[PDB]
Amino acid sequence: TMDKSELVQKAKLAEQAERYDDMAAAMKAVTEQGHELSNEERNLLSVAYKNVVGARRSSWRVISSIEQKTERNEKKQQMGKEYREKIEAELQDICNDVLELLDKYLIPNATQPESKVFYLKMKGDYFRYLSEVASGDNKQTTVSNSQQAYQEAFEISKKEMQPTHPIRLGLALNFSVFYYEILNSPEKACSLAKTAFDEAIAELDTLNEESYKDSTLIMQLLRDNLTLWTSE
Template identity: 45%
Template sequence: MSPVRIATRADCLSIAKVAEQAERWDDVISQLKSIITYSDARLSTEERNLLSIAYKNATSTLRNSWRTIETLEKQETDNGRATRREQVLLRREREKIEQELANVCQDLLKLLQTHLVPAADPGEEKVFYCKMQGDYYRYVTEFARKQNHEHYAQLSLEAYKAAYKHSLSTLEPWHPTRLGLALNFAVYYRDVRASPERACHLAKHAFDEAVAMLNDMPEQAFKDSVMILQLLRDDLILWSAEMQHEPGDVKADLLKHK
């Protein structure tokens, strides 16, 4: 009998890529965890992006399911159409989804805290992982019980602040990772802190700084950076409208640099 061959790092990456195409996100995550073990928590850009995609897809389905059940539960309760038995069943289904979502988020957060963030190089890699911490604590905040909501909201804020502070000193304003961080940090202020004013301030600052340096942007970063700038534009217009303020200066800037 031939000896069992231990999978190499290249084998794990190949399997992860196949699993990504098949949308088997648990398999992608499993293979990348093996790579983290092999590499002392140092992932290549390709591996890091695969990790992000896998956890994003694993949580997106659950987050959408949770929103659907939560909305249905509220509608049925407010309308008085659901029997007590139906209300109990809806609550149980919501809580089941919450537990599954919490497990996935905490799995990544533990991986980040224990392995990825401590091993990260200063600069883009560290910003990338700290941003992920902010994102996934924010996801937990969405469904956390009232007594835990502020705890996770604060952990998300601290992660975003650390990532943002580091990005300002290590990444150019047009860098896609810095812009993506600014976008998600602004969403945090809008959704978690219910402050469209702070969200607009942060997003507008990031937008203006990036637009001012568009001519210095390398070609390989242009597509990703412009896509995030468009998202920042859309959110700025939406949030400004919420504050009953017409963002004329924002629109003018974007039309000029579109």
């Protein structure tokens, strides 16, 4: 019914209106046409789902925080638990849909290494989001899948990208946050953030004239995390 041009415009309209569920549906339909996305289309798809999943991560944290602070009442605890599980169920569906797009279209159709790293990083991100709400066996599966996707992305970035590339730097940031928050490894988090920072400051001459401020901003986030994590 709707062609690619119509769905891309609909997504740009939905973004301005802050109607992210509409933005995500339009970009999901664009992806399912089976053709490789342009950088604009890829960014539209990423912003849409970041906001759709983001709202549930935020809500999950709020309801989790309330669950702990709430009084000893069997009925009240059960309401809170139920409500958290309703948010968890939504989060799982969102992450499963984007992981479906990544495995079926985005990763296999990626022809340039920039895009391959972007989508594998994205795969790591959404498995990390599944890990935050998962427990037991399932947690071990989503935690391994996250590390594996981040590592595959890291391997391609080190061989095919400049150490200042914003996609490579954003990956170093998210992967180091995975080690810190998901694996509870301040050592692995710092080792990764330090190496990425050092490698980038050694080759600032590789900064792209189109994205130099994207690079310096992420480099600041890396450095700030390193000084925060190496406190006292």
